[PDB]
Design a protein around this ligand. Structure first.
Ligand SMILES: CC(C)(COP(=O)(O)OP(=O)(O)OC[C@H]1O[C@@H](n2cnc3c(N)ncnc32)[C@H](O)[C@@H]1OP(=O)(O)O)[C@@H](O)C(=O)NCCC(=O)NCCS
Ligand SMILES: *[C@@H]1O[C@H](CO)[C@@H](O)[C@H](O)[C@H]1NC(=O)CCCCCCCCC
Ligand SMILES: *[C@@H]1O[C@H](CO)[C@@H](O)[C@H](O)[C@H]1NC(C)=O
Ligand SMILES: *[C@H]1O[C@H](CO)[C@@H](O)[C@H](O)[C@@H]1O
Lengths: 323, 7
C-alpha cells in the first residue's frame, strides 16, 4: 500500500501526510509485528492492569493483516517508529495521530495494539539494562490507567495518550513507587530526571513521595550510569502557589510543593494556559459547562471558584535536588 | 494548553 491510500482509507486528515510519508520511508520492522491473541492477550492485558471490560473488547477487535490492510500497515510502521528510538530520550515523543472512530473498535484501540506489539521489545531493553522485572511491569501498567481514563472521559473504550506511552515504550521512563522518573535533558543539555505523578496509586502522601525520591538516584546511577542527573524537574498545575488561597495545610500538594524551588517567572494574570491542564487532571474535562462539574473536594471547589472569579491557573516549573 | 510534549 502507499501513504495516500492508507491516509484516505483510515480517514486521516491531510496534515498527517508527512508522518505517513516518514513511516513509508522507514518501512516495516525487522522483527515482524505479532499481536497476542486469546488467553495470551488476556493475560498480558491483565498484567498491564487494563480493566476487564476494555480487555475483552480489545481482544475481540484485534485487527487482521488481510481484512484490515491500511490499519495493519500503520500498526507495523508506528511500532517501528517507536523501537528505532529505544532508550533515546533526545527523540521527540511521536506516537502518531489518533484514528477516526468511524473505523470502529480496532480504530479506537489502535494505540493499545501498538503498545501490546511493542511490549516484548521494551521488556528486552529492560533486561539489557538490568531493570528488575517488578519495576518493568509496574512501569508498563499505566496502560490500564490510560485506557480507564479514556472510558471515563468519553464514555467508550479507547486510549488517546499515545504520545505519553512513547516514554514507557522507549524505556526512558520508570515508575519507582508513587512517582515516575524519566531520563531528560535541559535546553543546555544538562541531564535531569523528569518527575511525573500517575493517577493510580492513591494520595500523594509525604512518605510515599519521599520513598520515591530516595529511589531515583540509585536506580538511575545503577542502570543508566552515563546519565548522571542530580536534580528532578517538574512542570505542573500542582506547583501553582495560587493553590495556597484554597487548600489547607493538610493538603499533600501544599505540604510537598514547599520543598520545590520554582525557576520560572511569575506568569501574567491574563495568561490562560494552565487552565486546560488543571481542568484535564482534576475533571478530565471535555468541553462541558463549569457549574455542571462535581464539587465534592476542596480542590474541585477551588478550581471552579477561581475560574468563576475571572482568574487563571498556571503551570509552574521548578526542581528538587535528588537525595 | 491540553496537547502534552515534551519537545
Ligand atoms: C496527584 C494526586 C494523586 C494528589 O492527590 P492528593 O494527594 O489527594 O492531594 P491533596 O492532598 O492536595 O488533596 C487536597 C484535596 O483535593 C482533593 N483532590 C486532590 N486531587 C484531586 C483530583 N485529581 N481530583 C479531585 N480532587 C482531588 C483531595 O481529595 C482533597 O480533598 P479534601 O480536602 O476535600 O479532602 C491527584 O491530584 C491525582 O490523582 N491527580 C491526577 C494525576 C495528576 O494530576 N498528576 C500530575 C500531572 S502534571
Ligand atoms: C503529563 O501529562 C501526562 C498525560 O496525561 C500525564 O500522564 C503526566 O502525569 C503529566 N505530568 C506531571 O505529572 C508533572 C508533575 C510534576 C510536579 C512535581 C510537584 C510534586 C509535588 C507537589
Ligand atoms: C520534556 O522534555 C524537556 C527537554 O527536552 C525536559 O526539560 C523535561 O523534563 C521533559 N519531560 C519529561 C517528563 O521527560
Ligand atoms: C509544539 O510544537 C511541536 C513542533 O512540532 C508540535 O508538534 C506540537 O503540535 C506543539 O504545537
Amino acid at each position: 500500500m502507499d501513504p495516500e491510500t492508507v491516509r484516505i482509507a483510515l480517514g486521516l486528515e491531510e496534515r498527517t501526510a508527512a508522518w505517513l510519508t516518514e513511516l513509508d520511508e522507514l518501512g516495516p520492522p525487522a522483527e515482524p509485528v505479532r499481536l497476542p491473541r486469546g488467553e495470551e492477550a488476556r493475560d498480558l492485558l491483565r498484567r498491564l492492569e487494563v480493566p476487564e471490560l476494555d480487555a475483552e473488547e480489545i481482544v475481540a477487535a484485534a485487527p487482521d493483516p488481510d481484512r484490515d490492510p491500511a490499519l495493519w500497515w500503520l500498526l507495523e510502521r508506528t511500532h517501528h517508529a517507536i523501537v528505532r528510538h529505544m532508550g533515546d530520550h533526545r527523540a521527540k515523543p511521536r506516537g502518531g495521530p489518533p484514528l477516526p472512530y468511524e473505523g470502529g473498535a480496532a480504530a479506537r484501540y489502535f494505540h493499545v495494539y501498538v503498545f501490546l506489539a511493542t511490549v516484548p521489545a521494551v521488556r528486552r531493553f529492560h533486561a539489557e539494562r538490568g531493570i528488575p522485572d517488578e519495576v518493568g511491569w509496574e512501569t508498563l501498567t499505566q496502560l490500564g490507567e490510560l485506557v480507564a481514563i479514556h472510558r471515563r472521559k468519553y464514555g467508550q473504550g479507547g486510549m488517546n495518550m499515545q504520545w505519553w506511552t512513547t516514554y514507557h515504550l522507549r524505556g526512558i521512563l520508570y515508575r519507582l513507587g508513587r512517582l515516575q522518573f524519566s531520563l531528560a535533558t535541559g535546553k543546555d543539555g544538562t541531564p535531569h530526571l523528569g518527575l511525573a505523578v500517575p493517577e493510580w496509586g492513591g494520595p500523594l502522601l509525604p512518605k510515599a513521595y519521599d520513598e520515591s525520591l530516595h529511589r531515583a538516584r540509585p536506580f538511575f546511577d545503577r542502570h543508566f550510569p552515563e546519565h548522571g542527573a542530580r536534580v528532578a524537574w517538574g512542570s505542573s498545575w500542582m506547583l501553582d502557589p495560587q493553590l495556597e488561597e484554597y487548600l489547607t495545610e493538610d493538603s499533600n500538594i501544599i505540604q510537598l510543593a514547599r520543598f520545590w524551588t520554582l525557576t520560572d517567572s511569575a506568569p501574567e494574570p491574563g495568561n490562560a494556559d494552565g487552565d486546560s491542564s488543571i481542568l484535564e487532571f482534576v475533571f478530565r474535562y471535555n468541553g462541558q459547562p463549569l457549574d455542571e462539574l462535581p464539587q465534592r473536594s476542596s480542590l474541585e471547589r477551588a478550581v471552579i471558584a477561581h475560574l468563576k472569579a475571572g482568574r487563571h491557573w498556571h503551570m509552574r516549573t521548578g526542581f528538587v535536588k535528588l537525595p | 494548553x491540553y496537547x502534552x510534549x515534551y519537545x
